[PDB]
Amino acid sequence: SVLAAANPIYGRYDDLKSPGDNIDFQTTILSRFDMIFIVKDDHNEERDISIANHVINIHTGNANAMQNQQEENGSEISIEKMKRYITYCRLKCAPRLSPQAAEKLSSNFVTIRKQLLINELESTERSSIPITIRQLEAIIRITESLAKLELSPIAQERHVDEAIRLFQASTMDAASQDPIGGTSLSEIRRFEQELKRRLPIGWSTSYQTLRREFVDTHRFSQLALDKALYALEKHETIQLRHQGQNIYRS
C-alpha cells in the first residue's frame, strides 16, 4: 500500500484559482489513488486557540503525564499491541459482501457518476479528478477493510454506510469542490437589481413564485438557483429558513 504526501502548486491551494491548475498530476496517476484528502488551513481563532493550547501542553513538561492516564483508563492501546492485533487480523479474517450491500453500492456508484456528469456539463471542461470503476472497487475494498476490523465473516450495511461516508468526504472535499471555479455576468447584475427593487428588507417571498416569474421571463430556472445559493453564500442580506420555501432578506 502506498501513502503519499504532496503539496499543490503555489504553496497554498489558492481556492480563488481554478482547481484545474492547482494540481499537476495527470489523470492516470490519480485514478490509482482512491482517497484524496485536501487539507486546507483556516482561521477562526477558536480552533487556533485549541491548537495553541494543545501544542503548549504537549510540550514535554506535561504530556508525559496525561498520555499515561490514557493507558490507565483504557482509552487507548500501545503501539506494539496494535501491531500484534493488525497482523492477527490480517492473518485470520477475510470478509465478504451481501446482495443488499451490492445493491446499495451499485446505486451509490450510479448516483455519483450522474453528479459528475452534471458538474462536467456545467463546467464545460474535463474534471481534474476522475471517477471510474476503480473507485467502485475502492469503495468495495473500504467496506471489506471496515468489516475486517471486527473479524466479521460477512460485511453488512453498518460498515457500508461508514465507508460511503468516508468516500463522500474524500469526494466532496477534492473533486466536487467549487466545480464552477468562481449568459455570463450580465444577467447576474440584472437579477440582483430586481430583488432589491421588488423585495425590501425584512419581507419574504416563496421560492416557487420567484422561480415561476423568472422562468416566465428570460431568466429561466438554471440561472436562478446558482446565484440564489450564491447570494445565500454572501449572506449579507439573504437568509434561508423553514426548509427551502422562505426566502428571508436580512
Partner: protein
C-alpha cells in the same frame, strides 16, 4: 550491607547516584557532585563502563573485593558511615534479597499499583493497593515483587527529578520559626496525592537540609496541589540530626507539635479543613484558606 538504593537489583553507578545519604554528603544536584562521584570511581578503580552493568553480570573479582575497596577508599570522602550489617534471605536458586530492598519494594508497591466521591475513590484505591501488597508477601509470588522493585526505581527517579528542581528554584523560604516550601506548579504533581510519597519527598528534603552548615533546627512544612479538588495537602515534618552523631546528644527524640498547632487553630477558627488521617500531622486545606491559616500558625505559640 550499605545505605544504597537497590544495590543487588540495579547497577552500582545508579546505586551511588540515587542514595539519599550520598546525595546529601556530595551535593549531586549540581555538576560538582557528579565530578566528585567520577573522582571517587576513578580512585577506587572500577571502570565507568564496568560500574554501569547489572549486579549479576558484574565482575566476580570486583564483587569479591568490593568490601576492601570501599574500606580503603571511603575515608577521604567521609562516607564511612555507609557500611552497616543487615539481613539477607536466600531460598534455593532464586537469588538473594535484603531487608532494605524488600521493604523499599513493599513501600513502592503500596504507593503505586493497579470532591467527596473522588476522595472516596482514592481511599478505596489505597485499600486495594494495601491488599495487593499484602498478597505480595507470600513466597509463591515473585512477579508481584519484581514489579514493585521496578516501580521503586521509577518513583525514586521521579522524587529525585522533583527535588533537584526544588533546590534549583530555592523555593524553601526561611521564616523566623519554621521553613516553608509550596509546590505551586510543576510536572507529575499528581503523584504526590499519596501521603507516603509526600513523606518520602520530605525525608529526602530534610536529609539534604540537615547535611549542611546551618546551625538551626527548624520544622519544615511541605504542601502540594490537587487541581481536581482545588485543595492543598499539607504535611508537617520534624527535623533530624545527622546520622553520624553520638548518643550523648540523643537525650530525647525531636517531638512533633504540628498536630497540636493544627487542632488548636481549627478549634479557634472556622477554617475549611479535613483532619481525618491517622497521621495527626497531615491535613487537607483549601487553596484560598492556606495563607490566613499560615499567618495564624506564625502567630500562635508552637
Amino acid at each position: 550491607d550499605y545505605y544504597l538504593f537497590l544495590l543487588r537489583h540495579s547497577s552500582l553507578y545508579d546505586s551511588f547516584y540515587y542514595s539519599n545519604y550520598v546525595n546529601a554528603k556530595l551535593s549531586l544536584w549540581n555538576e560538582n557532585g557528579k565530578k566528585r562521584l567520577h573522582k571517587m570511581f576513578a580512585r577506587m578503580g572500577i571502570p565507568l563502563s564496568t560500574a554501569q552493568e547489572t549486579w549479576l553480570y558484574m565482575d566476580h573479582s570486583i564483587k569479591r573485593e568490593l568490601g576492601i575497596i570501599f574500606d580503603k577508599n571511603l575515608d577521604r570522602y567521609g562516607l564511612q558511615d555507609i557500611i552497616r550489617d543487615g539481613f539477607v534471605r536466600t531460598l534455593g536458586y532464586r537469588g538473594s534479597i535484603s531487608a532494605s530492598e524488600f521493604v523499599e519494594a513493599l513501600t513502592a508497591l503500596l504507593e503505586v499499583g493497579n470532591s467527596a466521591q473522588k476522595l472516596t475513590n482514592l481511599r478505596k484505591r489505597w485499600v486495594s493497593n494495601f491488599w495487593l501488597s499484602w498478597d505480595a508477601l507470600d513466597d509463591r509470588k515473585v512477579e508481584l515483587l519484581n514489579r514493585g522493585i521496578q516501580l521503586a526505581q521509577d518513583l525514586q527517579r521521579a522524587i529525585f527529578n522533583t527535588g533537584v528542581a526544588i533546590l534549583e528554584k530555592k523555593l524553601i523560604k526561611h521564616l523566623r520559626i519554621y521553613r516553608l516550601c509550596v509546590l505551586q506548579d510543576g510536572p507529575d504533581l499528581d503523584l504526590y496525592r499519596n501521603p507516603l510519597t509526600l513523606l518520602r519527598l520530605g525525608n529526602w528534603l530534610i536529609e539534604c537540609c540537615a547535611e549542611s552548615e546551618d546551625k538551626q533546627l527548624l520544622p519544615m512544612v511541605l504542601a502540594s496541589i490537587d487541581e481536581n479538588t482545588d485543595t492543598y495537602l499539607v504535611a508537617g515534618l520534624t527535623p533530624r540530626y545527622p546520622r553520624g552523631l553520638d548518643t550523648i546528644h540523643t537525650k530525647k527524640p525531636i517531638l512533633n507539635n504540628f498536630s497540636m498547632a493544627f487542632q488548636q487553630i481549627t478549634a479557634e477558627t472556622d477554617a475549611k479543613v479535613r483532619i481525618d488521617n491517622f497521621e495527626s500531622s497531615i491535613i487537607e486545606i483549601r487553596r484560598e484558606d492556606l495563607s490566613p491559616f499560615l499567618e495564624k500558625l506564625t502567630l500562635s505559640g508552637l
